[PDB]
Design a protein around this ligand. Structure first.
Ligand SMILES: [Ca+2]
Ligand SMILES: [Ca+2]
Length: 802
């Protein structure tokens, strides 16, 4: 019913310009909306010149790129313009003397510590923006020094620090900024990225910034020029926090611990400054999670609901600190729950901004998030926030769909809820719901016990297992059942957040009936893998299974595929579905298909002195340079094992089509002739992205040939066999839902199980000879064969001989 239009803007910074909401994010992406639900992108990313925001990107921001962010270190091959903040400065004096401009403060970065913050200005919010200055630097060193893949001198004299000492704004370099070896002290001093510009109660302007390293700092800003008013002298705050002559006042983080994307909001209605920051790492494996603090002053001390400091006492785990207002979660659609799909959940939600409406007092949390089973794909989400009785804004459980706080009747509150508790810990783990009832007698029962009260129109007080959470009841759009449902969100003085979502009233017999209808094992006529047989349905409905022929498929859905040539073997599985005293039954006819020879899906023979695929299923391959992503190198062609083969000079590689392997049953075969061995150098390499990869390695860390996988988990399939240079070796491996075999010249050399499932659901990047870390292969590659299914040992031998 409400309708959404989504965009991919990383690190969104929200700002209202008249009737339009805009968001500016990393990689020069921005978008606009009139309602916060339908977004439309108006930028063109890093495209240059005629860059939507910056015009001629390289020349406009050259002053910043001189220090980092342009084809240098981790930005080699392109640009790194990160996490901007945009706002209207009515006092800014333009270069023609007029007053008022939109300022975009951006960041540029080359390494985890060599970065800078600069800013550009414009008369209109869509740009283009013209460079003004580069104002904060990090990652500089005491004496001349350079980073890998970098020609830029990191000595502190190449920053604005000399100019400041000259003007008398600083007395001179701080000794504490460098380690004994002259390296940048990022244990105490910050990484200069992720800026946030905010006004305090008096209309003074401030800039908070930081990301990991020494943590988050805040500087007063000159409203006329937009330049920091550097403290000029070191010190401590009354309460003991670091003050630095240059970087400013420390308000959160420290000691290398996570924490970026600072956003600070002054709320005149409670007289607090609210500090938001994101812990963990942005990737789907990183446990990105939003944290909330508050202060009576713009420069701290910021504390959480437990009254603990945002600034860490030392190199410790930062999980206890900050109200964790959102992490990984899933309102799982269990069997029999209305709707389709796995339910609504987020993975690594974070780097937020906040829109606070000076008029209606309405508040919105704006951020990007990944999604369960979607990989690194991200979208923007907007959740409304509501001020609780303790002066803490609490986050709505569902994305904003137009709702507002209303008078709520007890009749509309009472009933069964799904309940998610965000806790304090964070990781790749995903929090799922439990089931509780808010009863008419103001008790809570079910998967937890306690009480609830509705106070006034809609404030909530929920007490579970000892803990009192305070928030609001509010009606929200559930995308799964596709109804507006009663919901609640509340926060304890432990800084812990609970979310509740009300379920439809249903008798036990209605539930069991719903479960029976929704229960489905998928296509049971062509079963080639074990079946997952659910033993639970929604609201703790129990499901129990039996077989009519366990020789075919067990009670647990373990299947026994017959001998190649046999007929398909069939059998019946029966489900018994109970809840209370209701019961139902469903039966499933399973047909298990026999084993089969693996099917050739691609064949790169190089027989025509090209990078083409012989079966014609897949496109040609393309030439690479030193790694899988870049280009430049060359592929020559010599006489091979079968015909012509491909030559790798040691500075090139071969990129193969995306989704070459797109399942969990597959095999690869190829001939190699190595001219030289180097450890961790790949031949066949495939990765869903630089974090989930498989590599066939001629010489591995044990000094032997092996199949290897990373980066989570790590599988070491080793053969204890050393590959000879100057000679032809045939290599093949097979993967089969967990088990894996590796073959050297037709001989099995490794059998293991529990091999990763790198390629299902994704559509991975594949290469020959090059990855992201290691020296390319040097020698000859021939007859790359790709299969669906596991190669029989018989097929292995044939390839190894003819
Ligand atoms: Ca930001
Ligand atoms: Ca060939």
């Amino acid at each position: 019913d409400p309708q959404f239009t989504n965009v991919s803007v990383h690190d969104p910074s929200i700002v209202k310009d008249g009737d339009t909401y805009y968001i500016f994010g990393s990689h020069i992406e921005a978008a606009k909306s009139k309602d916060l639900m339908n977004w439309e992108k108006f930028t063109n990313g890093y495209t240059t010149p005629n860059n939507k925001l910056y015009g001629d990107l390289s020349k406009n921001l050259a002053g910043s790129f001189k220090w980092a962010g342009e084809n240098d270190a981790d930005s080699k091959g392109g640009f790194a313009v990160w996490a901007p903040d945009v706002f209207w400065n009515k006092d800014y004096v333009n270069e023609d003397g007029t007053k008022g401009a939109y300022m975009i403060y951006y960041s540029v970065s080359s390494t985890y510590i060599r970065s800078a913050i600069g800013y550009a200005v414009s008369k209109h919010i869509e740009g283009p923006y013209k460079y003004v200055d580069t104002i904060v630097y990090s990652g500089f060193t005491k004496e001349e020094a350079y980073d890998a893949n970098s020609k830029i001198n990191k000595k502190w004299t190449n920053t604005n620090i000399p100019k400041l000492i000259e003007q008398g704004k600083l007395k001179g370099v701080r000794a504490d900024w460098f380690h004994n070896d002259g390296s940048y002290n990022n244990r105490d001093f910050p990484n200069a990225i992720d800026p946030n510009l905010f006004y305090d109660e008096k209309g003074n302007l401030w800039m908070a910034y930081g990301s990991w390293s020494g943590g988050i700092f805040v500087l007063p800003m000159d409203k006329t020029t937009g330049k920091p008013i550097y403290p000029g002298k070191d010190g401590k705050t009354p309460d003991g926090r670091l003050v630095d002559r240059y970087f400013g006042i420390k308000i959160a983080g420290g000691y290398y611990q996570s924490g970026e994307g600072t956003y600070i909001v002054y709320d005149k209605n409670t007289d607090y400054y609210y500090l938001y920051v994101t812990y963990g790492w942005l990737g789907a494996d990183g446990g990105y999670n939003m944290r909330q603090f508050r202060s009576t002053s713009p420069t701290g001390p910021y504390v959480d609901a437990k009254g603990q400091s945002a600034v860490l006492p030392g190199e410790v785990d930062n999980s206890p600190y900050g109200n964790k207002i959102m992490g990984n979660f899933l309102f799982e659609r269990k069997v029999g729950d209305p709707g389709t799909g796995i339910g609504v959940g987020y993975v690594s939600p974070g780097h937020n901004s906040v829109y606070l409406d000076r008029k209606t007092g309405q508040q919105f949390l704006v951020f990007h998030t990944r999604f369960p089973q979607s990989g690194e794909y991200h979208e923007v989400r907007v959740h409304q926030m509501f001020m609780n009785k303790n002066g803490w804004p609490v986050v709505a459980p569902y994305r904003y769909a137009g709702e507002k706080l209303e008078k709520v009747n007890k009749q509309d509150v009472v009933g069964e809820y799904q309940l998610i508790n965000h806790g304090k810990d964070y990781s790749a783990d995903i929090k799922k719901q439990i089931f509780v009832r808010l009863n008419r007698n103001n008790t809570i029962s079910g998967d937890a016990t306690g009480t609830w009260r509705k106070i006034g129109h809609n404030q909530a007080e929920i007490t579970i297992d000892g803990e009192t959470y305070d928030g609001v009841f509010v009606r929200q759009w559930d995308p799964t059942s596709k109804r507006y449902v009663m919901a609640f969100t509340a926060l304890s003085n432990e800084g812990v957040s609970i979310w509740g979502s009300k379920l439809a009233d249903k008798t036990d017999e209605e539930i069991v009936e719903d479960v029976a209808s929704d229960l489905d094992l998928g296509d049971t006529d062509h079963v080639v893998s074990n079946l997952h047989l659910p033993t639970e349905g929604t609201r703790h409905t129990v499901i129990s299974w039996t077989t009519s022929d366990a020789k075919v498929v067990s009670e647990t859905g373990v299947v026994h595929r017959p001998e190649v040539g046999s007929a398909p073997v069939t059998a019946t599985l029966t489900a018994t579905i109970t809840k209370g005293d209701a019961t139902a039954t469903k039966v499933f006819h399973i047909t298990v298909l026999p084993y089969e020879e693996a099917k050739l899906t691609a064949h790169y023979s190089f027989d025509n002195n090209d990078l083409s695929d012989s079966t014609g299923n897949f496109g040609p391959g393309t030439i690479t340079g030193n790694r899988i992503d870049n280009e430049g190198g060359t592929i020559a062609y010599a006489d091979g094992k079968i015909g012509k083969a491909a030559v790798l000079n040691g500075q090139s590689g071969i990129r193969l089509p995306d989704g070459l392997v797109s399942s969990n049953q597959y095999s690869v075969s190829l001939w190699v002739k190595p001219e030289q061995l180097t450890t961790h150098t790949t031949t066949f390499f495939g990765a869903k992205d630089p974090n989930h990869w498989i590599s066939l390695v001629p010489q591995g860390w044990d000094g032997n040939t092996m199949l290897w996988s990373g980066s989570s988990p790590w599988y070491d399939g080793r053969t204890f066999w050393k590959i000879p240079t100057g000679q032809w070796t045939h290599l093949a491996f097979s993967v089969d839902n967990g088990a894996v075999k590796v073959y050297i010249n037709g001989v099995e050399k490794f059998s293991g199980t529990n091999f990763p499932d790198v390629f299902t659901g994704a559509n991975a990047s594949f290469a020959l000879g090059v990855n992201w870390w290691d020296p390319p292969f040097k020698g000859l590659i021939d007859e790359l064969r790709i299969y669906e299914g596991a190669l029989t040992p018989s097929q292995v031998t044939d390839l190894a001989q003819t």
